[PDB]
């Protein structure tokens, strides 16, 4: 892009020959098991008109993939995290504004084709099967899709939701995955087994790593502030969320039918913060 | 290209050993939900005869993918954005001129072939089926095609229109996608379901990310101005648009037939701007 | 190549530790809708015996893809650009000479093979079907082929002609694409439709981007001049062309048969220019 | 990411123009055969508010893949390592905190498709076989999955567990791999052989290299400490583990049926360590 | 290679910290339409014992792809270039010697294996069909093969000959391509057409770009000379060739049979040159 | 990894702004035909607490692929090297310790999924053929697998053993490769031939290059030593091994049955060495 | 490797901040048509204990692919080069030793798995067809294999032998390629033709480029010498070889059967040389 306009590389960039102020803020949630890391770097480029503070939202959010409760030798349920979210918010009254953020929403690329279709040899003719022709396509489906919640001048949000999961190397089961005979098969182990329901749950290790241990954010954001602002201080609200579902399962005495509610429980490890732009330091 | 003429890399470039002026202008639309970011960098290279101001049109445009209205337990509609556009315009009287822009329109590459065709073994002969031979091809179709509206010395425009969308992992449905029995199936959930029409709409998360939250421009442009101009100031008109369609659906008591009008509503978050070339600053 | 002779990289290059003169010339065609950009960079390397001026032919040429005329509810035509050309010419009397140019004409790579052929099991024998064996191949066909018109010491020409186009994801139709029953199907929408012919044309957005808006040159050239020339000035003739065709269509009351003439109309946005080698500046 | 916000590369980084202190600590387990390497590098960047000590956990853990015992000409067993783990722990009372770690848990990418499905030619119709359509998919399964145990402010853990193994180039056998007739076939050599059971074990060289010799960690971690801490010293607990299983096998006089217990034995080469932050040295 | 011996990159190279002399020689053939470009760069490295002059043979050779003559409404011919050659020669008496040249002759890589062959189920047995097994292979065939004519201390030659060409996307026709019924089909348009033979020739644009306009050399060579030579001057003979064939065609009143002679005509734009090693300049 | 923690590249590295001592030790085995090369480089980084001497084990080990003996017109054998090994050892009493080594043992990656399996159309149902489903898989098998012998604080060992070999482009024969009718076919030429057995051996050139000439180590190791050690000297034991097998073959008057013993003969070109850490030199 | 031990790149290398002596030696064989180029670069690194002279064996060896003799209208032969070899030798008495060489012998990588095999549906059972299962495999076979002759402290040799060749795009014929009916088909043109045998030979241009013109070595070697040697001079013996075969062919009056002898003739362009290590110059 930059070099495509024949501009020398790095000419239209920022963060050079200046004294920046980085930092390190670490916080842990003893109850929800959520790790927090908001590594920052203040930018005060002279050529750049406004101030900057690139916010790197590191850390991790645990999974808590465990059997929360059992209700008999044939009935039991499991709670698993379904959507880790980070909706950072900035108070309206503050003049500070979000101006750039990564990741973002990118186009999804398909690859469609057509193999063979003709009216044979021995054989007005506007059959409806004209769409019933070669339809070869291809694309990929990551199990967790890092979406970007539609931001604004105040709130920048992300949502890493559950797309689908493969079980027993058979069927890309998703958040609904309903089979009338067997119910849902998201984390099943035996279809017609007679084992204990609490113990008849798919092993967390042989599944996606995100569910078992957790997920680690690596998202980034920059907030821009007027250089001539009287008060060089704002409020950063960091919010780590989790959406546990209720993947219940019961034995119909013939096969195991399971039902999963949507967003049964939520967690919110919100945390206030203060930015000392004058000191170019994010106070803990 | 440059090195292919044996020129040393970077010799025929601009933006070196000079003092450039960058900046930051952020604006948000409280009603249309449109974000605006026009990050700029003034260029005043001595070897280069004219002035420059590379305009980087960042920001985002929301999607507003929601059920706008319902008209009964069997009839309802949805409004979804179809074409985000950025048609920046510059007044005619101003001597400032656009000279380069990215992205542009690139050639589309196919890959055609032929598998097998012959007159068997046991078998003048100019059958019409000579085109009915091996026709294997391959290419890709992004769901949103970032077109470049044919620019001029004043107006440089872009249009990120909707190419197609895949639903239920079955059929690359597009802006027309008409099936006489079922109507349009762009965002359907159940074909023969009996659920509420307002609630019988495909979930925004399991679709393209652009529709749900929105789309973020990353387009760039440069306007060149005479170095000996008496008045070192022009007018930049930044325009963010959206084209919501009207994807209604109704139950024929047998199956759900939906119709989508074209360009039912539009939005235009136009914004005047002033460039202080003398100050090498884009005033807010 | 250079390093293959064990020469240090960049040793046999030009454009280093010297003062070059770049520039910017912008011009627009109010009638033909053609943009012009001849970004230049003068080279006066001391080690290099001759002078240089690398000419970068940027800009764009509009498409003007519109329904030029209609001749009844069943007969109508469309004019679409078929070959954008840039034939720069330099007057013969001038000693200035072209010496290098990019792009050029490159070899086309096929990939041929053979799957299976044998005289079975139960089965002198020099059948003509010895060529009727495994014939698997593969290669790519870009829709617009940037050819290099055979240059000389005076004229360097390019021609970006139309190779083929895919319609309805069915058939790589080309500049002739004749089917006796249906005529030409380059930009058809309905084969047996009853809609208005002027409105029965394939949408420009769902086709190649070049036809709808236009095409943007990025070609480059260098002209070399004697360093001891008495008159340090020549004449650059920049020429942007377009070849609109006449893709008419008519309804045979059974199906739509269309005919496309070849090179029905042309445009030539020729422009004289003057090079001030003494000033190392391209005067507008 | 960094350059996507147009920041100059390396601007938002640490570890520059400062005097760091590296080191080398080597320790070996004469009994368990575990190698230990905790290569370290102290960081005291002035711009960075806190202290750092990036911990590189090199070394190796042997496999001890040998026939531990035999119980007759037809019955014998083998002990093989199933899960190498490194759960470094830091005492709670110490203010030192973990802030970043690599590797982490990444999304798993599938690639799903659909080949062909239609209601033929000669042939309401809501068959249950609508999911019985083209389901072409592909992905990769590494035999050892480097998982990241859900960390916290004190404990950062890893677990390189056994995913699956291919035997005789036939069947991706895993940790359960139960066939009722033949039992488990993880490390079998002959299915209906009459050879000695202790000698009827798959050769360690023609299997995964990890089991035979061992596995070498290359994991990394950084602990951050308050710069104004009164006591500049903490306690690093490095722990190398192993989980030997009991892959026994017996001859049923017709075929060899083997059973593998889960986590029969474990090893823990825990090692206390002391960090002299004042000296910027990790004492052995 | 160099770094594989642990040598620092660039240590065993030439052309550093020295004053080289480049240049520019341009010449055009007003009759044969051949462009000549012998861009040069003198090398006088002190560490290197001998002198150098790396010769870069740029320029182009036209195609002259036109209907040379017609001999009736059914008989006509076409002349097309078949082998562009550059055989640079240096006089024997001169002590100057060629020492390195690019391109060179490289190995051709195949990729072969077997799919399936077995003696079925129901079925000494040394059938001759043991070679009639899986023969899947793959490789590529460029249409023009840049061969390196076997050089010597005096003559360094190249030959870019015609390998094959694809017509009508059907059959990789080559320099012989004989079919008894239809003759040769190298540049045919209609097999059983009744159109004028002079006009019944494949369009040059829809074929390889080399034939229509021409081909551009980019070959390189270096000649090494004794540093203590009394006479610091030699003679460079640059030779650009072309081999037009005679692709005639005639109508047998049933189908068009064409014959192509081999090397019917040739062209030789030889050019003497003088090297002033003392001046480190290639005089025109 | 390093940059993933946002550390500047090269910050956590060693071997900079210091004076290192390299060297060159060459030795050849006149009898076993083993070449020895232990290229070294002493490291004395001030920031690094300990000393270093990176040991690069270059050289080669011959193959000696020849017909060692013949025992009649129908019986003969061949000796071929099966496992080149380099087990460097360091005496226990010496405080010097191995701390890092490359290559190491890496995970093996498969690629598995399913094509198609269903219960047809016209057709409780827990058939054992549920594993008999789409089992498409693929991976690579190098013929010589560079394993890493499980090291310790004293001995670091490698073993490049024979995985498999392809003969006659038919069958990936391995170290056992037993066919009851034909015996082993590792290096056979004719299955039912009548030629001399000593001459009926597969040509060494049309096989793997390692067997014919030999194999060249490129392995590396580093030993770390206490900086405050009283005696700055240890003993490096370099050992190059070879494991010739006995691939005999005999004619059963119908077909050639061959047998290959395991590890029939071995060679050990052990060599003592002395490191003068004080001189920073490896004495020959 | 180097950076894998966390060593800074280039730390354990040679050839830096020192004055090296390159050179240029050119020689041509007027009879055998062999070019000779032994480009050299002396290395005298102070840190490195020994001396160095990296030998780059450039040049070329002609092919002489011509019809050597004809013996009747039906019988004729062709001589073609089969194995270009470079066996450089150094006299035993000289202390100079070879220590590193490129290219070397590398492992060959296959890619094998199974597609489908099962005992059907309607169908102890240890059939011999258990090896008759999915055997999909793939790998590459270059036509000329650059082998490394097993070197020693004195002689370093290479051998670029003929692997196979494809004729008529049908069959990868090799050095034996015997078919009883047609004989050898290495360079045949017509199988049942009646043309002159001397003229019935495959055209050299439509075959591998190596045979027609020749092959160009690019091999490299380094010889190391004691720095304290009394006599700083040795003897380099450069040897370029060729192995012409005798590919005769005769007409059996039904088909053309050809026989090719092995190594019928050889050539040896040996050349003595002298190294002046004191002068750091390779005298011609």
Sequential DSSP letters for F123-134:
-----GGGSSS-
Residue E113 φ then ψ, to 5°: -160, -165
* C-alpha–C-alpha distance, residues G275 and C217, integer Å: 57
* C-alpha–C-alpha distance, residues D7 and A224, integer Å: 13
* C-alpha–C-alpha distance, residues G255 and G197, integer Å: 12
**Residues of F whose CB is below 8 A from E112:** 169
Q: Is C112 in the G-facing interface, judged by CB distances under 8 Å?
A: yes
Question: ∠ CA F14-D84-A33 to the nearest 5 degrees?
Answer: 90
Q: Is A169–F126 a contact, with Cβ atoms under 8 angstroms apart?
A: no
Q: Is C126 in the G-facing interface, judged by CB distances under 8 Å?
A: yes
C-alpha torsion angle, residues A165, A171, A173, A179 (rounded to 10): -160
Return the closest-CA partner of residue D258 out of D171, D183, D180. Answer: D183
Which residue reads 């916010």 in tokens?
A55
Interface with F, mutate which of G2, G7, G103, G175 (most F CBs under 10 A): G7
* C-alpha–C-alpha distance, residues B93 and G269, integer Å: 80
Computed from CA positions of residues B83, B86, B91, B92, in that sequence, does the dihedral angle turn out positive or negative? negative
* C-alpha–C-alpha distance, residues D69 and D77, integer Å: 6
- Give, as one character, the DSSP assignment of residue G130: G
Question: ∠ CA C50-C54-C56 to the nearest 5 degrees?
Answer: 170
Q: Is G169–C114 a contact, with Cβ atoms under 8 angstroms apart?
A: yes
Residue of E nearest to F171 (CA): E114
Q: Is F108–D142 a contact, with Cβ atoms under 8 angstroms apart?
A: yes
3-class DSSP assignment, residue G69: strand
CA–CA min distance C179, chain A (Å):
16
Beta-carbon neighbour count of residue A191 at 10 Å?
16
Radius of gyration of chain F (CA): 26
The length of chain C in residues reads 284
Residue of E nearest to C143 (CA): E206
- Give, as one character, the DSSP assignment of residue F210: H
CB D117 within 8 A of CB D192: no
* C-alpha–C-alpha distance, residues B186 and E110, integer Å: 47
Q: Spell out the alpha helix ranges (H) of F88-163.
A: none
Interface of D with A in 164-193 (CB under 8 A): 174
Residue B212 φ then ψ, to 5°: -65, -70
Q: Is C170–A126 a contact, with Cβ atoms under 8 angstroms apart?
A: no
Interface of A with F in 49-68 (CB under 8 A): 56
Do at least 3 CB pairs under 8 Å connect D with B?
yes
Interface with C, mutate which of E10, E13, E26, E220 (most C CBs under 10 A): E26
CB D87 within 8 A of CB D157: yes
CB F234 within 8 A of CB F103: no
Neighbours of chain D (3+ CB pairs under 8 A): A, B, F, G
Residue of B nearest to D5 (CA): B58
Interface with F, mutate which of A169, A190, A255, A256 (most F CBs under 10 A): A169
HSE-up (13 A, CA, CB side) for residue F8: 15
**Residues of D whose CB is below 8 A from G130:** none
**Residues of G whose CB is below 8 A from F56:** 12
Return the closest-CA partner of residue G84 out of G108, G54, G56, G64. Answer: G64
List, in sequence order, every beta strand (DSSP E) within E63-205: 66-70, 75-79, 83-88, 97-102, 109-111, 141-142, 144-149, 156-162, 164-166, 172-174, 178-179, 183-184
For B66, B79, G120, the CA distances from B265, given in Å and listed in that order, are 14, 9, 61
Structure tokens at C143: 């829709």
Instruction: Identify the burial level of B101 via C-beta atoms within 10 angstroms of its C-beta, where 0-12 means exposed, 13-18 middle and 19 or more buried.
Output: buried
Resolution in angstroms for this experimental structure?
3.8
List, in sequence order, every beta strand (DSSP E) within A71-179: 75-79, 83-88, 97-102, 109-110, 141-142, 144-149, 156-162, 164-166, 172-174, 178-179
Strand order in the sheet with A66-70: A66-70, A75-79, A241-251, A256-268, A183-184, A178-179
* C-alpha–C-alpha distance, residues B138 and B113, integer Å: 9
For A39, A135, A209, B17, the CA distances from A214, given in Å and listed in that order, are 20, 38, 7, 48
Interface with E, mutate which of C3, C7, C121 (most E CBs under 10 A): C7
- Report the greatest alpha carbon distance in chain A: 87
Question: Nearest by CB to D192, which of G113, G126, G133?
Answer: G126
Beta-carbon neighbour count of residue A204 at 10 Å?
18
Say how many Å lie between the first and final Cα of chain B, rounded: 39
Neighbours of chain C (3+ CB pairs under 8 A): A, B, E, G
Residue of E nearest to F58 (CA): E5
Q: Is G116 in the F-facing interface, judged by CB distances under 8 Å?
A: yes
Listed as own residue / partner, the contacts of F263-267 with beta carbons closer than 8 Å and 24 or more positions apart are F263/F82, F264/F79, F265/F79, F266/F241, F266/F242, F267/F32, F267/F34, F267/F241, F267/F242
CB G176 within 8 A of CB G185: no
CB E183 within 8 A of CB E256: yes
* C-alpha–C-alpha distance, residues E246 and D42, integer Å: 78
**B29 Cβ contact list (under 8 Å, min separation 6):** B35, B36, B240, B269
**G236 Cβ contact list (under 8 Å, min separation 6):** G38, G55, G88, G90, G223, G272, G273, G274, G275, G282
Interface with F, mutate which of D9, D19, D24 (most F CBs under 10 A): D24
* C-alpha–C-alpha distance, residues D60 and E170, integer Å: 60
Structure tokens at C87: 């034939």
HSE-up (13 A, CA, CB side) for residue G9: 4
Do at least 3 CB pairs under 8 Å connect D with C?
no
Question: Nearest by CB to G6, which of D39, D169, D170?
Answer: D39
C141-160 burial, b for 16+ CB within 10 Å, e for fewer?
bebbbbbbbbbbbbbbbbbb
- Give, as one character, the DSSP assignment of residue D8: P
**A23 Cβ contact list (under 8 Å, min separation 6):** A39, A40, A41, A281, A282, D48, D49, D50
Q: Is E6–F39 a contact, with Cβ atoms under 8 angstroms apart?
A: yes
Do at least 3 CB pairs under 8 Å connect A with D?
yes
HSE-up (13 A, CA, CB side) for residue D179: 19
C-alpha torsion angle, residues A90, A92, A93, A98 (rounded to 10): 60
For E129, E130, F192, G177, the CA distances from E125, given in Å and listed in that order, are 10, 10, 11, 21
Residue of F nearest to G7 (CA): F14
Q: Is E56–B6 a contact, with Cβ atoms under 8 angstroms apart?
A: yes
Which residue reads 């830091």 in tokens?
D90
**Residues of G whose CB is below 8 A from E114:** 135, 137
Beta-carbon neighbour count of residue C230 at 10 Å?
6
Q: Is B137–A114 a contact, with Cβ atoms under 8 angstroms apart?
A: yes
Return the closest-CA partner of residue C40 out of B48, G46, G6. Answer: B48
* C-alpha–C-alpha distance, residues C26 and C44, integer Å: 24
Beta-carbon neighbour count of residue B232 at 10 Å?
16
CA–CA min distance F15, chain A (Å):
27
Beta-carbon neighbour count of residue B96 at 10 Å?
25
Say how many Å lie between the first and final Cα of chain D, rounded: 39
For D189, F44, F107, F125, the CA distances from A169, given in Å and listed in that order, are 26, 53, 21, 20
* C-alpha–C-alpha distance, residues G89 and G91, integer Å: 7
Domains of chain E: 1-284 (2.70.240.10)
G11-49 burial, b for 16+ CB within 10 Å, e for fewer?
bbbbbeeeebbbbbbbbbbeeebbbbbbbbbbbbbebbb
G190-219 burial, b for 16+ CB within 10 Å, e for fewer?
ebeeeeebbebbbebbbbbbbbbbbbbbbb
Question: ∠ CA E261-E262-E263 to the nearest 5 degrees?
Answer: 120
β-bridge mates for residue E23, sequence order: none
Question: Nearest by CB to D112, which of B56, B169, B192?
Answer: B169
* C-alpha–C-alpha distance, residues A172 and A178, integer Å: 12
For B7, C12, G13, G105, the CA distances from C16, given in Å and listed in that order, are 9, 11, 30, 42
* C-alpha–C-alpha distance, residues G186 and G211, integer Å: 12
**Residues of C whose CB is below 8 A from B149:** 213
CA–CA min distance B109, chain E (Å):
16
* C-alpha–C-alpha distance, residues A55 and E194, integer Å: 75
Residue G27 φ then ψ, to 5°: -150, 145
β-bridge mates for residue C55, sequence order: C40, C221
Residue of D nearest to G125 (CA): D192
CA–CA min distance A124, chain C (Å):
9
Q: Is B37 in the A-facing interface, judged by CB distances under 8 Å?
A: yes
β-bridge mates for residue G283, sequence order: G274
Q: Is E131 in the F-facing interface, judged by CB distances under 8 Å?
A: no
Could you tell me how many CB contacts below 8 A there are between chain A and chain D?
145
Q: Is E113–F169 a contact, with Cβ atoms under 8 angstroms apart?
A: yes
* C-alpha–C-alpha distance, residues D280 and F56, integer Å: 31
Query: After which residues does chain G have a break in its backbone, defined as C to next N over 2.5 Å?
Result: 123
Neighbours of chain G (3+ CB pairs under 8 A): C, D, E, F
């Amino acid at each position: 892009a930059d070099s495509d306009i024949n501009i020398k590389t790095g000419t239209t960039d920022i963060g050079s020959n200046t004294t920046v102020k980085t930092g390190d803020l670490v916080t842990y949630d003893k109850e929800n098991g959520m790790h927090k890391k908001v590594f920052y770097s203040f930018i005060d480029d002279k050529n750049h008109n406004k101030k900057l503070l690139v916010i790197r939202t590191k850390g991790t959010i645990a999974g808590q993939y465990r059997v929360y409760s059992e209700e008999g030798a044939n009935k039991s349920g499991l709670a698993w995290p379904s959507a880790f979210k980070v909706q950072l918010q900035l108070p309206d009254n503050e003049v500070a504004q979000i101006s750039d953020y990564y990741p973002r929403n990118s186009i999804d690329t398909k690859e469609y084709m057509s193999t063979l279709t003709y009216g044979f040899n021995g054989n007005g003719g506007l059959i409806g099967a004209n769409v019933s022709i070669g339809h070869t396509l291809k694309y990929v489906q990551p199990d967790f899709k890092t979406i970007l919640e539609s931001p604004t001048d105040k709130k920048v949000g992300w949502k890493v939701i559950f797309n689908n999961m493969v079980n027993q190397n058979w069927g890309p089961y998703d958040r609904d995955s309903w089979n009338p005979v067997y119910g849902n098969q998201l984390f099943m182990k035996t279809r017609n087994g007679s084992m204990k329901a609490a113990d008849n749950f798919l092993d967390p290790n042989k599944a996606s790593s995100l569910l078992s241990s957790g997920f680690s954010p690596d998202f980034a954001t920059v907030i821009t502030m007027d250089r001539k602002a009287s008060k060089q201080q704002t409020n950063i609200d960091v919010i780590y969320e989790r959406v546990r579902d209720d993947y219940q399962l019961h034995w119909t005495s013939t096969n195991w039918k399971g039902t999963n509610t949507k967003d049964k429980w939520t967690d919110r490890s919100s945390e206030r913060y203060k930015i000392d732009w004058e000191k170019e330091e994010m106070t803990n």
